[PDB]
Amino acid sequence: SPIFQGGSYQLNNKSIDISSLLLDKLSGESQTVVMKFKADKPNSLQALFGLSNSKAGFKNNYFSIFMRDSGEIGVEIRDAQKGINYLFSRPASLWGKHKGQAVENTLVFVSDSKDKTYTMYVNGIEVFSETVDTFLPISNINGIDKATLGAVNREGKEHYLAKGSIDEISLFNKAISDQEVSTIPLSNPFQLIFQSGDSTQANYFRIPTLYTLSSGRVLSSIDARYGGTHDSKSKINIATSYSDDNGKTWSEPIFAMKFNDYEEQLVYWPRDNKLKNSQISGSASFIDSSIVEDKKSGKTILLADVMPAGIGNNNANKADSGFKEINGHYYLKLKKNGDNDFRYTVRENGVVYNETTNKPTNYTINDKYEVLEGGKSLTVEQYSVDFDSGSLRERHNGKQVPMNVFYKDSLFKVTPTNYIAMTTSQNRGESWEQFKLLPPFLGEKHNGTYLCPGQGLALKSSNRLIFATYTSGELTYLISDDSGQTWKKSSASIPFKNATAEAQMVELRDGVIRTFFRTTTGKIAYMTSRDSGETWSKVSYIDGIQQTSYGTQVSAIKYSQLIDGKEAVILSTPNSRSGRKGGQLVVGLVNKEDDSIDWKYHYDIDLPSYGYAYSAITELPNHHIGVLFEKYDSWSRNELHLSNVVQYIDLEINDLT
Numbered sequence: 001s002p003i004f005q006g007g008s009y010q011l012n013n014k015s016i017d018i019s020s021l022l023l024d025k026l027s028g029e030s031q032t033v034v035m036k037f038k039a040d041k042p043n044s045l046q047a048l049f050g051l052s053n054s055k056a057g058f059k060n061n062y063f064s065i066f067m068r069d070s071g072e073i074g075v076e077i078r079d080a081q082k083g084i085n086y087l088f089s090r091p092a093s094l095w096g097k098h099k100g101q102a103v104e105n106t107l108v109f110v111s112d113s114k115d116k117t118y119t120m121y122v123n124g125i126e127v128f129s130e131t132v133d134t135f136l137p138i139s140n141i142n143g144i145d146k147a148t149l150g151a152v153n154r155e156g157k158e159h160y161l162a163k164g165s166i167d168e169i170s171l172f173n174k175a176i177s178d179q180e181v182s183t184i185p186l187s188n189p190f191q192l193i194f195q196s197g198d199s200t201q202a203n204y205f206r207i208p209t210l211y212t213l214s215s216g217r218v219l220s221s222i223d224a225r226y227g228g229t230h231d232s233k234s235k236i237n238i239a240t241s242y243s244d245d246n247g248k249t250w251s252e253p254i255f256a257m258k259f260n261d262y263e264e265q266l267v268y269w270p271r272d273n274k275l276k277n278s279q280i281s282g283s284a285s286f287i288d289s290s291i292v293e294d295k296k297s298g299k300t301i302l303l304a305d306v307m308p309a310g311i312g313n314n315n316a317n318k319a320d321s322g323f324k325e326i327n328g329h330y331y332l333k334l335k336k337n338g339d340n341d342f343r344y345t346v347r348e349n350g351v352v353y354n355e356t357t358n359k360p361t362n363y364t365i366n367d368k369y370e371v372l373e374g375g376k377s378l379t380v381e382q383y384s385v386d387f388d389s390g391s392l393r394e395r396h397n398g399k400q401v402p403m404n405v406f407y408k409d410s411l412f413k414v415t416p417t418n419y420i421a422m423t424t425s426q427n428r429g430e431s432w433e434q435f436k437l438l439p440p441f442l443g444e445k446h447n448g449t450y451l452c453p454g455q456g457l458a459l460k461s462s463n464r465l466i467f468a469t470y471t472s473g474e475l476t477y478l479i480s481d482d483s484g485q486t487w488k489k490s491s492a493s494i495p496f497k498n499a500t501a502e503a504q505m506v507e508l509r510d511g512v513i514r515t516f517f518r519t520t521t522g523k524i525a526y527m528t529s530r531d532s533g534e535t536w537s538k539v540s541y542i543d544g545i546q547q548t549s550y551g552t553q554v555s556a557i558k559y560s561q562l563i564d565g566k567e568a569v570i571l572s573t574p575n576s577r578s579g580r581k582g583g584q585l586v587v588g589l590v591n592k593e594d595d596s597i598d599w600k601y602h603y604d605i606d607l608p609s610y611g612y613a614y615s616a617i618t619e620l621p622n623h624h625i626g627v628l629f630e631k632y633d634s635w636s637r638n639e640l641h642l643s644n645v646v647q648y649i650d651l652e653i654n655d656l657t
Contacts, residue, residue, distance in 0.1 A: 002170040009169075011162040013043075015151035022147040022171065029113035029137040030175040033065065034184065038102040039094075039164035040607065042069045047160035049169070050152035053143040059154045060085070063138040065109060066160060067094060070581075071610045073122055075109065081142045084134065088118055090127040091639045092632035096607035098189035099655050103606075104167060106186050111138050112175035124186050125644045190647040193220055193241050193250045193628065200224040200239045200253050201264045205646045207453045208628040210616035211291045213300065218243045218618060219429045220628060221256065221289040221302060227280035227385070228269035228641040229634070232312035235262045235385075236285040238304050242429045247626045247650055256302050256423050256432040259284040261309065261407040263384040263397060269641040270387065276640055278392040280385060284309045284406040286421075292456030296463050297483040299424045303451055303467055306419040306437070309408035313418070318447045321440035322415035324355075330439045332365075334405060334412045342415065352412065363412065367434050370402040371412055377402055380409040418448045420469070422484060441476060441489040449476045450500075454555055454616060457505045457513065459532060466533050468503040468515065475503055475517070477533055492527060492536035496520050504556040506569055508595055514569075516542075518551040522577060528595070544599050545586060546577045550635065553614040559587075560619055563653065566590060569597055570656075572615040572627065576608070580633040583612025585625070587656050603656040605629075605649075611639070625651045 003025040009016055037048060045068050053061035060080045067073050074089025095103035108121040116135040120127050149166055151158035194205045202224035209221040219242045226235035237258040241250045262283040270276055289304040307316070323330040324345055331345040334352065347353045350365035364372045371378045379400040386393055405414050421435040441449065449469040456467040465480045477490040494501060496519060503517035513529045515536075523541040555572040562568070566589040576582040583605035588597035605612060605627075613630035620626050632645040 001172060003173055004171045005169070007166075007168045009149055009166040011150035011164045011166065013161045013163060015153070015158045015161065016149040018147045018149060019145070023144070026139040026171075026173065028173050029135075029140065030173065031111045031138055032172040032174060032176045033107070033109045034168075034170040035065070035107045035166060036104055036168040036187075037107070037164060037166045038104055039067065039162070040097045040102040041163050042067060043161065043163055044069050045160060046150075046162035046164070047148075047152045048150070048162060048164070048166065050146070050148040051138060051141065051144050052146045052148065052153045053141065054146045054153040054156060055143060056155050058143055061141050061143060062152055062154070063141060064152050064160070065107070069607075069609045071096070071607075073107070073120065073127060075118065075120070077118070077136050077138060077141075079136060079141045082136065084136050086118075086132070086136065088120070088128050088130050090120070090642060092611045092642060092645055093122045093125075093127045094610070095123065095189060096610050097604065098606070098649070099651075103189050104187045106184065108181055108184060110175050110181070113137055114175070121181060123188055190649050192644060193648055194222050194224070194239065194253055194646060196643045197266065198253055200237065200255075201266045202226050202237070202239075203266045203268065203643055204229045204641065206630065206634065207288055207614055208616040208630070208646055209289055209291050209454050210618040210626055210628050211293065211455050212618045212620065213293050213428055214295070215428060216244070216621045217428050218247055218620065218626065219291060219300065220250070220616070221291055222646070223287060223289070224253075226265060226267065228276075228278075230279050232285045232287050232307040233283070233310050233315070234280045234285055234312070235283040236287055237264070238286045238289045238302070240302075240429055240432070246620050246622050246624065247648065254431070256289070257286045257304055257306075257421065257435050259286075259404065259406065260401045261380070261382065261404065261409070263382055265384060267385065271641050275387075275391070276637075278387075280392075280394065281310050282383060282394050282408045284404075288451050288453040290451055290454055290456055290467055292458055292465055292467065294463075294465060294483050295458060299426055299483060300428055301422060301424055301456065301465070301484050302432070303420055303422045303438075303456075305448070305451055306406070306421045306435075308406045308414050308416055311416050311418070315416070316447060317415060317417040319445050320415050320417050321444050321446055321448070322417050322419060323440050323444065325444050332437070333415055337411050344412065365405060365412075368402070369405050371405065371410060378411065379403055380407055418450070420448050420451055424484065438478075438487060441478070441487075442471070452503045453553065453614070454504050457507065459511070460507055461510045462532070464532055466505065468505060470499075470501040470503065472498050475501060475515070475536075479533060490533055490536075494525075494539060500551070502553045504554060506556050506558040508558070508567075508569075508590060512595070516554050516556045516571060518547075518553060520549060520551065522547050522549055522551075524554055524571070524573065542599070544602075545571075545573060545575050545584070547574065548577060548579060548635075552580055555615045555617045557617050557619060559653075561623060561653070563587065563657065564589060564600075567592070570617060570625065572617045572629070574612045575602070580613040580635050581611050582608040583610075583615070583629065585617070585627070585651070585656055601657045603651075611645075620650070623653065625653070625656075627651065
């Protein structure tokens with residue numbers, strides 16, 4: 001079926017000409033390129049493949065498949081006479097190295113004249129799909145006379161010289177279907193747990209977690225993000241999946257926490273500069289999850305932040321908890337439609353009580369935070385979103401759903417601020433219970449704290465459960481000794497105002513906790529408790545790892561085995577002062593005399609220039625390490641709204657050292 005096939009070409013800053021093999025075979029208006037290639041030391045911008053008009057006066061007449069040392073992939077399709085200059089790309093589409101060896105990437109470009117569409121897949125993932133009104137076949141460019149590997153020949157000179165290798169290349173005079181694409185063999189160093197088109201119906205995912213349960217099951221949680229990769233305000237649900245075989249295969253995702261005020265739509269969110277900041281603005285959401293397992297009860301516990309309709313971090317009421325204190329007890333406040341003030345509370349058995357007239361109403365709130373009148377369920381109409389009119393529209397879709405107090409159309413509404421909720425599973429992640437709000441920890445006039453995403457900590461020698469959270473000026477550890485039925489706080493002051501101090505904990509020895517956390521200084525910080533978390537030391541910093549000024553979540557575990565005769569801690573973080581890239585696992589050996597850590601080994605996840613943001617790590621039952629991570633720069637305004645960049649890998653200790 002192919003018109004051309006070649007192999008083992010080495011690109012060392014000198015192009016290979018293949019004109020007399022390929023050019024005379026190109027025909028018709030549809031084509032497909034399949035390319036298996038390695039590039040572990042790429043130049044800044046380099047072409048892998050070129051079709052050009054190399055004659056003087058025609059320098060803007062070519063097709064190329066190009067890559068950047070940031071991991072971006074794209075095509076150019078240019079014809080000066082037709083007036084067409086197409087450029088399509090997506091960042092963070094590529095792999096560089098895995099376990100000291102160059103990764104073979106599989107690229108498939110489809111040029112389809114019947115539908116007027118250009119489609120790119122890398123490593124089995126669709127990275128762009130672009131329909132045009134004036135279609136330009138790649139073979140139909142005016143005066144093409146060269147086919148080149150490792151450059152584009154423009155006016156006689158090699159432009160975009162490449163470093164790398166093309167192990168295999170094939171061309172077809174056909175636009176192959178999405179069915180035929182799925183049958184091309186792949187050499188992937190990674191797998192997917194959550195992905196576009198699964199049961200969540202979210203097209204985006206952020207904020208991975210991983211935790212190894214006592215049965216050997218590995219559980220993962222994540223943000224299922226509907227309106228692009230934007231934080232709240234937006235539509236976001238919390239989804240989960242588990243593996244019963246050391247991470248080799250994963251279950252179909254379910255919801256741990258979800259709202260029904262807006263539809264679950266799989267949407268292609270715009271990436272152009274005019275529309276990319278569009279944000280879903282009338283929906284409730286959840287954001288940032290954390291997991292722990294409780295030994296005594298056998299329950300699995302998951303917390304996440306909760307945002308009412310149209311609320312997120314920058315518009316949330318900072319001077320209000322959402323609760324009223326009436327003699328040491330806390331009651332959720334509510335505002336009725338037509339009132340200027342919060343005149344109601346939710347008392348015992350969900351009774352809506354009028355604070356102004358001190359009388360109970362005919363309304364109640366159920367365990368699901370839904371409103372009943374005289375025992376009868378009230379409803380609201382659902383919204384859906386679209387870009388059909390050229391901008392974002394949010395509108396009623398004709399479907400009735402239970403009236404919830406976090407919803408925009410509810411007769412009774414909560415304070416517009418941030419909350420924390422918990423759910424539990426009694427079957428290790430196969431189903432999740434209805435969520436319950438946690439109470440305020442810092443008083444009536446203080447907004448909720450922010451949960452640190454990743455793992456809670458279960459102390460080895462006791463029944464103590466701890467979840468780190470942050471707020472302005474401190475880490476607020478939430479402690480429960482009774483399977484999450486009651487909670488208390490433990491504050492640890494930090495020398496930063498308004499930092500995103502996302503924290504993760506390890507147990508060095510019984511009752512001894514070291515917490516590693518994100519700061520605003522470009523260094524990872526730490527503090528120790530020898531108290532089982534009652535009291536905390538001052539702050540110190542890690543040398544040998546760099547972050548940016550705004551910083552990035554760091555994951556941390558205590559390994560179960562000795563390395564070079566000593567106990568070991570493993571950290572996962574970007575190691576770069578420029579952006580969220582240069583991902584590492586760093587292995588530290590503990591000194592038994594003073595609890596200091598000697599960071600002795602630094603393992604390269606991929607190339608220094610390739611994206612790496614938030615991450616999850618766990619020791620798998622077989623002593624391997626599982627890593628689930630954002631493989632892109634999640635801060636950059638150039639890398640927003642990418643699908644299937646949250647990816648999973650498996651490593652062994654001997655790879656790291």
